[model samples]
Target: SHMEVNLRMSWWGGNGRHQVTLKALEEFHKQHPNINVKAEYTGWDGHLSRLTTQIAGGTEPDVMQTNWNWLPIFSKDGTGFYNLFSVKEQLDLAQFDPKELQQTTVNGKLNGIPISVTAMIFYFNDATWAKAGLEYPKTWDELLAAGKVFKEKLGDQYYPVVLCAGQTLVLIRSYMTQKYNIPTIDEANKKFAYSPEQWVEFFTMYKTMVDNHVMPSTKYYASIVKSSYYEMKPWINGEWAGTYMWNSTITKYSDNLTKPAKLVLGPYPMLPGAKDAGLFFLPAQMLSIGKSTKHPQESAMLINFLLNSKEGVEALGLERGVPLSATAVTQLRASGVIKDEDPSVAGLNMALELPHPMTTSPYFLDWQIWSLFLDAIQYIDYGQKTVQETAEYFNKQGDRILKRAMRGSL
Candidate 1:
């Protein structure tokens, strides 16, 4: 007898992701004829708004792909979401470390499964560098030097590097951490602690990136709507050489470059006599289950197949930032499928564990603060503000909003 059990899934990723996930679903259905999944996918542009509407209506998909930060937004405690622990037998989570499990859990219930731990670092297109007669930049000085070379050979339309507001924040933090070993927000103190001089240094550094041609002026990027050079023609046509990017997004960036690109994760550069790498690391993405889903067991199977099942894992490879399932990670590692990305993870199975003090404040992510930081950096990039003015305005304005957030005001 033929049977049918259709599952609804929602996620946000690029075309490569959309294609692979659907292919994985096809394999899952071939093995379990009764199980089929209809995917609702989109880019990040309007995903949250659509998903939020669905979640509130109690009509979210059976399987959900979400951000780690979304835990605070959608479900502060596990009760507001599906309890993965309740489906432990169906999900097969023995491979997850206790801490990884704990971090992904809330209110004593496991809410989501992390796809990959993330670290902010440089992703270099080796082919682009070779054409420019250079290697991956190893220092801030070298990075700036390469920018000049790019302009000389490729003209003013291209840059050696690109950065988004988020990536810029990562670079700013890493720079500050090396100089001070402190995060911009001191969660313990509930306030930002950068000195005026330090803030000026931060702005000055950004200004250099623009002036030296290491990165284009904010005016250049603002004219375009895209946040990443990866999507721009200069990037697509081999004019942009590298970027500060997240470890999990290696392929998202590299796969799109308009050249025979070899992506290499570079170390987060530090200042001379700096103490720490100042890398910002966290879970890349998480898989969640809808609390309203009637097919909890089948939902777990979907997660298992995509994240852990041998057939499913092979189809997905390390596409979603290393596998969350320990069994899958092991199998892939033994078979040389996990690649050498995770042994140290920052490209070298790398390790640098910062204390909680250095972690970014969730409150700092408020659009009020985040966008302000972006604006101030642009002002500096466009020479609209003197470096010192940028520092003062950014630090003070950012602190004001963050303070409100800490006090429970939006």
Candidate 2:
């Protein structure tokens, strides 16, 4: 009954992850000699576009990494990928939380296996904050004021925080949801929830943050050297003092800091009397089999090996952040791989304690929407469009995007 089978697997991550994952695959091959896997890996950029092309041409790998938000776009009704549930015997679904499992399920078809859940949380360079004689701000006003302090004390190069265009959008959403307690996209109505006037306020908030020195404007950021923030000299040396980042991916950021400059979990800033945190909490990433895979059983076996096996657990450690499997968590904690002081673990713990009453629409994760909002921010910062004009343009174009996505036409 044992015939030699070949499978291709793909994922995107940093060099550290790529190294350990290759090691894990080596171990997997030794155990299951009948199965051979070819790994195609790269960094975060362009991975999605490549996957899109592969899927369109029916040439995707047998097993591939996926994202939580991609479920709606790739598998609207859950037919896009091979349902992992179909290989229940090979994959131990019992090891994961049922509630977490449901997040990857659509129309009763499990599109992928949830690797871990994540939420955006604040992280600050402790040494840099101390350099400015400042503690992390607890309120919005204090955060804005700290920018001036950073400039006056540490010179123009230092800032209280830095936010990429996408991160800027997250903070804006958090601020708006707290003020109005509404989801960004009203799924029930299949449209954006804010009026044109409210959208004006939204853009205005971004401008205020830029004006107050809370973060660099898009114009200023672009004018400087363009590269990964983690690789930037200012970030590595602690001039970019803080960030609002995901718990699952904070390792790449913290690891790059110069020696003696530590990254610590900072308190999430909230408005007065705000009931909701408006956190963009979801699965960090997932493992799935392509729908057209001929070796579904072998593919499922590899997924089991990477996620639930002891050798795989040790090799992965927290590289993929904390594992959602109770078995993996218990093993990691008992082995001291995860500790209370670990910034990634601490960040996730803090995220769990926040009051996130509102649900974010999956449409909010659309790449088109991300680009649209970023373009609007550039319009305001670059003086290409007035604040009111940007709002009008966004509401008109944004509505069409959301409407099409809601109809599964995107």
Candidate 3:
């Protein structure tokens, strides 16, 4: 006996995301006549606050979108949301990699189903590179050398690559990991794994990148604008020639480029003797059933439909990055929804082929710690502190932040 059920879903994104998601919901409703999904969509700014309020009152939507970093805040011991394993009959757990699921698992409970995996990959502007009479750099030395060529040939405004603070962190991590093959964070010891000398190398690497014209210093970027990198005039005009950006969010960077200025996936630079790519790979987002949901089976069905069904995949397309579900990718590829030429797809394929033996600690990129690192960079950039001083400061302050966060969450 099928009974009518109403389930609420919540997500945050742009108008395009909102529209495509609603269309997919319509497809889900068509597939299961008794199930109605009420989408509670909102802009990115206020969604977290709103969800916190709802979750506190035990009134969250049956199915909701969540970020990878928010796992610690919402599910300290993995009870923040419904245990997805309980609804395995409705959700196809076989469709994803166990490692992918492990990232969302805590205390042996599966908290959420990841929608897609994301990693920072390089993309270079063809027009800008052509103007500099150069090919995309295949090695770190080449990348750094191209900066001088870009400055002399194109102008001082032209840079071989542009990196925001977060990208800077990943770039430094990748370089350090390749050189030393050490974990970025040692949560087991409740402190960052990098030594004082390693911290010095990290800050010095940033200084080298800036000094060599590889990218603008934080001070120079601040003088340009207090807005997103994509909105800057240099990016629009192809003066900021490339970026190390996420596969899921590269569209915003590519879409804003001037006409005929295409952003293509560039080779990931590997230092010699590097065994691991040291990628900052993780899920772009996850779909989780609320702990207090009245209809978890139905909620799982919706997630399965959206992630595994052809109708749902066609409706959603690549709006939510490439789906993590193998079936979704197969269906999308067979139907020509995903093309090899697409930069994001190609970037993801490249990332998957690289060696990523090191597991990222969730504490590595905690927002507060991230902000602290960014501030440390600014201090060096603005000449407020020496690189060595900033390095020591970060090593001291970062440890306290990690210790507190780990204690609170564990």
Candidate 4:
């Protein structure tokens, strides 16, 4: 039952991801017998730039894996990618979670199904906690207190938390969780729709944490800028107690750390009942059909089979994070193909119980806002500017970025 179709797929990840994904594709060939699949893999950094260039150069793959943030940007410009909503009957939109469905919807049309659910979680070394007589944090105040204790116990050797001020997305999520009732990028309106003052308050809180020495010194962070959090010199050697990280990063951190580690769930500091709690459920990467493909139906069939079939779950597992489809989640979990060690389940449960940030339509320029924040923080860390001066500089840059986005340069 070979379909006489050839598919080219692309994604960015490490060797493990590439190996697993290729195994999945091989399995797909087993079922179809006749379909041919080609895969391309790369590191995540600079992925958007490369993908955008490929698409513009008319070299886009038949099926491509894309991040959630890239969807709005690609779809908004009337690019040739097939709209998931247009192929709804073929793809079965009803199978995915409601939140995922809403998040992927653009102008009331479904564009993609997220491959996984991602959120920020507090990952700690249980042995370290027990040694320090500390418990997992349940509330914002508790987290602060625990951080202070960790600092006191570990001194220069222990940074209670690692916040990547250089990462705009992470900092924005942190600020949004603390400041607003909702976090979303409104493309049409060209604004965040949340309180700016709250953002400043969140920044001030971060400043307080830095001033109190609860976090790694700005000097220490600068020293490790190349490896960033992934830098193994400090984290792998057991110099830090915990870090705020995405659920997908569990495996990476575990591999880097010297001892056993566990992920703990906590509420986003300001909202006690917020279901998403300091977390954002990104579209589990996407597998979309190229509009230019001569075999759109065949391509859709490949995706449909991959998502809905037992073979698909077996091959992909929770590597993409838990599947958004309830059937996929149930089948994968029931078969033991996915396990608790898979952080996606924990992330999904946390998201279900917490309030989610609002969805944003794609805008490329907004990303610069993140870069500007990083640069401003560097200014503060390097003693080049006061915190107030840095804040003002960031605000001005943010305003300019927002205005440019409004103008639709991209």
Residue 194 accuracy (lDDT) in model 3: 96
What tens-digit string does per-residue lDDT give for candidate 2 at 1-410? Answer: 66699999999999999999999999999899889989999999999999988987789999998988777778876788999989999999999877567767876899888788888778899999999998898878888888899988888888888887777778889889888999888766888999888999999888888877787778656422122688888899999888887777777888899988878999888899999877877778899999889999999999998899999888888777788877888899899988978888888888778887776766788777877887888899889999999999988899998888867623
lDDT of each: 0.74, 0.85, 0.87, 0.64
Candidate 3 per-residue lDDT over residues 13-58, each given as its tens digit: 9999999999999999998999998899999999999999999889
Tell me the tens digit of each residue's lDDT in model 1 across 1-410.
77678899988989999888888999999988899899999999999999888888899899999887676567754554689988988888876756566667765888888777666677777777777878777677888898898888878877777777766766777777877987777655666878889889988888777788987677766422235576788777766667776566567777787546756666555567765666665667888999899888999989988888887888887777677577777878888966675423545245334322345544545666667877887777667889999899988888787666554411
Worst 10 residues of 4 by lDDT: 222-231
Measured by lDDT, the strongest candidate is 3
List of clashing residue pairs for candidate 3: none
Q: Candidate 2, overall lDDT?
A: 0.85
Alpha-carbon runs more than 4 Å astray in model 3: 2-5, 223-227
TM-score of each: 0.70, 0.80, 0.90, 0.81
Q: By TM-score, how accurate is candidate 1?
A: 0.70
Residue 163: error of model 4 in Å? 2.2
By lDDT, highest first, what's the ranking?
3, 2, 1, 4
Question: Which ranking of candidates, highest TM-score first?
Answer: 3, 4, 2, 1
Q: Residue 85 of candidate 2: its Cα lDDT?
A: 89
